[PDB]
Amino acid sequence: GAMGPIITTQVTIPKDLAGSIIGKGGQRIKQIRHESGASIKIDEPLEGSEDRIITITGTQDQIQNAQYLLQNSVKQYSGKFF
Template identity: 70%
Template sequence: MAGAIIGKGGARIRKIRSDSGAGIIIDEPLPGSNDRIITISGLPNQIQMAQYLLQQR
């Protein structure tokens, strides 16, 4: 799932960062898990836009 968010060579996540203006950090998986934590920072409208774009396929 993280690959779908990050995109080939990081292209998708770079575009989402650029389009939303938000900071987005994707942590490495926790030990014994494939889950990753995504942290979004910025102004409320930037965070909302980043969340929206991350949920699109």
């Protein structure tokens, strides 16, 4: 069916979770991009920020999928939550 316009959403992640979404060699985020169909950009933190901004661009369904998969990626997160 109709997926509608490509749109861009941003979400922030605590910087320490970023490694979980990216994965070794970027393998996780490559997968999430591939699976979701969404473009996904994870920035560096802005000057002295605890967050990184992820920009997700795709149809609403793709962005929705990407978000879910990014959230899911935390479950695999290998560092200290605090």
